[model samples]
Target: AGKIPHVLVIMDGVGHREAIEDNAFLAAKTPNLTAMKAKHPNSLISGSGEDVGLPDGQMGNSEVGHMNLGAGRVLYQDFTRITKDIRTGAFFEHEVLVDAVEKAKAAGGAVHIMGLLSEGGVHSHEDHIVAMCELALKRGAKVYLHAFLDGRDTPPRSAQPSLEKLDALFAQYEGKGRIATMIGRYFAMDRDNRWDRVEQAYRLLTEGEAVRTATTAVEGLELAYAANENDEFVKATRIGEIAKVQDGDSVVFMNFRADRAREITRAFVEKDFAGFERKVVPNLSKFVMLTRYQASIDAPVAYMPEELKNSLGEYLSSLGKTQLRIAETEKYAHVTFFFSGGREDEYPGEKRILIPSPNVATYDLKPEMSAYEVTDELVKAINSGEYDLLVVNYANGDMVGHTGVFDAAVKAVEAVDTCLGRVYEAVMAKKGHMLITADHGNVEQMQDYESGQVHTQHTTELVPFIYVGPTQATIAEGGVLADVAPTILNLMQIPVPAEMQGRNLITLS
Candidate 1:
């Protein structure tokens, strides 16, 4: 193989595009990223949609992008499968979903569907919500929709379009289906065990605290957004006085994805879990999830890394190459869990480190989130020469990018660039090969091309893949995230696993 040790850096949410004039990555002074792209062999990677096993027209997320990166292949994600099933009528007849709807119908109670309220296609889709409501209504059960607004996955302060769509759907179903409750996802979906945020969501849903009632979704969102100008998602707003779940009512969390959905689902499904602090718990007999939580996601289908075995890390470990993975809590799971091809548990020989994320409600509030600390730890690991592979994720670009703050996101990217410079210096000192890439794009396309406002959602843009090594590795054309793992293996002189579907992006001697 090659003599140089390999270091992989994931600049999370940093996408690349040429046409946009205000792309944050271009706006920021990123000498390291620029040098790698200009000096070394680099390729533009496809980070979203069918290329990464997500639904066509859907954008990429950290989960899907990192999954493809680690697995070295396309694994059909839940969003693609679920949307297809719902469109083909298979979802309506699903045993689990049907059973819940029938039980509610038989018991003379309403069927409640709770999830994100957007067509962003990351967490949940608006059409899927509409489909669930129509299915429940057709089955003769009253339908109640509890929606979480999407300011992150879609344009910031752009909940108005989604709200209007849902309002029309509620009007179409009139007596049978109605919009019950609404809240921004920031409070409801706690992926990092933030119970205090979860508690705020629970009270808003159950006790209706700090909630202003509105007749329509647009009215409620207008009020909420106007009241809280800086961060719309952090404020909790409700529409109509929806009754809390009683004995016969059925609750279904329709979010196809996990992570954020897990916290809310646990509140409904787990009977004995006391982690959620609340004044009163609702008594509901039946609770059903549209899909299994995280572990069993994408089940019953044979795909890459079957049984979650043989990830890039696992393969590297099998070759006697020790490694270190590090990231802040905001994206620690991306570098570890999703990077292990959906395996939450770490392998035997891998050393994982998690820096505590700032306990702030919004990431933009603290735009430079622990980048210096993460970079300090990474430089130490690189200098220690204790491991062959050092994988690091700087979450600032992606985390702060989602906030639609140009200045903060610019600073975030600059912070990542500064970190890159520090790590690159260390790697050069250690004589290690370095790879810099991103999971998906967000900060790059900061302003909306149409409205000229800040764009908050993950972009379906091309990400940069730059490699600097001992040998002149020629990056292949049409490269992608899946190719990175194979390229790393090639650089390490280890035989690429046959099961991995990505092509080697470099010419290895």
Candidate 2:
């Protein structure tokens, strides 16, 4: 670490290419990133999402993505192995998640298998979800597996068929009393255009008349508005409000991506809700940082912290509003997330907003995602209007793409673009910078295996990178995912430490 200044880097996923000319986003007419790339001579370099320490394999997910960027070295992901361990009954040590499933099973409660419905190894894959269903069923957990479609990362029109397949898989357990109901949450597949993706998914699922009227009605804002009040986003928003009227018993989100997941996670874990906040819990037992965006100094998890434990007696004297109920926190975060989704119809005559979904029919159908982490600090930050970072990552672009949803992959790009636009506007309003990046490429260069139409999991082909900012000339050239940390440091004027392998783009500085 050098004499530091605050810097901000957005490690857009898959910022690599076999050759520069092959990179679509890089070659695109994006002024912001272009200026940054051109500003530095060594701005571009070829590194591995895996070799650079993404996850365990050649593939990369948000978990390893931030870990590598933060630790300045690749850390082990072992996700696949972990899954296998769970399958072999080796990962039930704490068993909080498993215990809940077991308790639900014992009580004959609805042991619903809720998770991502794709083969994308980055998140809850189809196989993993099915495996969960199997495990729960074996343990007497009645499951309802909501199969959220991924048009952004997987092929276009993949969700519909994928859901069908999921149903087929569940059909095997039909009479077993071990339920697996694969409900389709028609979500947008593209990770970049999240807002638009939500809208698109709504259009797919909403009534035809309602879809027709939903249009851009804003007088001068150029914002997409509902022509009438019955649009899907609107309806979903209303549904979210009604659900809020009731109390949630328990919810679980098996999301490995921590950034976008954190918002919803905080909603579940905090009692006194604040708005998107991160804090250094002094003398706490947690030793973990934000696993998604490592730069995020929020919700540090800890198994043991000696400093806090040793000083607990003394620290108790200075204890302020350090703890609160988690249920309220989840509700607040859910409201925040609902609004982000832009559900026009579900106004409920109240201003309560639903979470901005990555796509429709995915987390949208189940609003419980807002409650996954400790949200006390975040709730305070959000209410205080303090500028906080919300980095949302959707695995569809890479995850679904691996499923050979070529057409869906294109749509996924459009979806993520829309979502990022929303966050970008919010950042601009708050005078904060928004960085949209990915861990690696998935769909942009999908290749079917030799066995006909099946896609191979590995993609040696380079992923694409594009940076959009209020200022066109602020982005750096050929920025790798590794460079993200250094870039953020530079933006904040924080010194880039020597241990950091990434270089900050001069353009952003």
Candidate 3:
């Protein structure tokens, strides 16, 4: 790779759509992105849902999409693997579940299940949690539920639907088990190592701090929705009625994703693991996590492949290629850890820049999240000519899109495009190759036109993948995120790694 350095810009959450009414990407004035797509429409792609290895009918998420984009393969993701395992009875038969139940029975204490309570397949499915609760009840173990309410992955403030279903499920258990604690997923699952956020959740679960007291989740859901007619659901209204955990109880944090679950896992399992300053560390009896955190931090338990084989960056670095990865605190790991097939460790000669995300609790509050700073850094790096390969993720579109705010999301998309224009100029001046794509769709479909309501979930939509450079290689009209890495390598005229499963979209002339 000489003066033709390859640049990859992950225009996160900006997807393609047919309708313009509720779609934030279409509503936003994105001259650069629009012109690029019109000029090279074939380069854009379908980069989400099943195209990225998520289960059919399930929405694509940042974790799975980013992993596929960087890995250059359709590795079975958590939602797909877990769903299959559940259907085949493998999950019920697994040692983790069986042993946790056994330990709780032997200790004469209740088996506690805690996870996101939603039909949303992004994190932990509501059915999976229900199944585990039923299994525990059948095993003659007292079951307790600590539900993490989700509004981000599903319709905003609609935890009541899942809660009602769960309430009915718990009704069968009656005196044996019941819904114990309820808190927003935002507090408990901060992926960017925000200890303060995690601590709020920890205190709520253990010490009953920073949460409104509620008689039941159902009541809280109704009240919250009523409180904000403009906003569908308010997280602050959803309260946590703490389910006191005594010694000999076995608590399982059931979400399989690593980034969000890791901090809470450390809080429950390790006593001396000091990644951040903690005001309160609860004394717990036993903690069982569904999967270990990233391998770079060295998880206590072994589960899931610590690393997913060889990655595009790993293979390219092995071939003496220098690379730089950039993103904000929100999605910094996606470009590095998840992208490298879950390999958390950085390879030699690979540089990474992580800008500090705003300290605000909600992303929609600051719609344009650190995109300008990320752009500024990328422009400097491109102008400096330090690395042969550079990868960047603009997180505003996805972050603000999740807030379900149409105007803010539109502005967020515009911010991403504006920043993209800067990076494009820099790459063109360097005579370098640039590839712009997204992990999944969010801003593309903000509201359901049929229902006339806002939806915060990722849509089963196609994201754009635009290429700009001086290569005779032509990309096909339709492709997936996995094809991205191979396309970049093809544009660089580098041989695709044997382990990479995606086909090269570009046909060399």
lDDT for each candidate structure: 0.77, 0.37, 0.75
In the range 214-313, model 1's lDDT, one tens digit per residue, is: 7776777777877764223646666666556666878878786656777766665565767665577766546766655555332221112346567798
Q: Which candidate is the best by TM-score?
A: 3
Cα RMSD, each candidate: 3.3, 14.9, 2.7
Residue pairs clashing in model 1 are none
Question: What TM-score does model 1 achieve against the real structure?
Answer: 0.91
Report the lDDT tens digits of candidate 2 across residue range 1-509: 11111112223233444544223333333443344345322333323445654443445544444444443333445454556666777644425446656555444454433345565555556665565556555665455443343333343324444455555665677744321222122222223234343343223222111222211112101111222321112222111001110111123344444334443333334445354232211121111221221223344331111111101111111232111111122123222222122121222212222233233434323222232222222233233342222333343344334434445544444444443344344445544543444555544454443434344243444444444444554445555556665655555554555555666654642
Q: What local lDDT score does residue 251 receive in model 1, on the 0 to 100 scale?
A: 80
* lDDT at position 496, candidate 3: 84
Considering TM-score, where higher is better, how would the candidates rank from best to worst? Answer: 3, 1, 2
Q: How many pairs of residues collide in model 1?
A: 0
> Per-residue error at 128 for model 2, in Å?
2.2
Query: Which parts of model 1 are misplaced by more than 4 Å?
Result: 1-4, 55-57, 229-234, 271-276, 296-308
Clashing pairs in 3: none
For model 2, the run of ten residues with the poorest summed lDDT: 237-246
The Cα RMSD in angstroms, rounded to one decimal, for candidate 2 relative to the true structure is 14.9
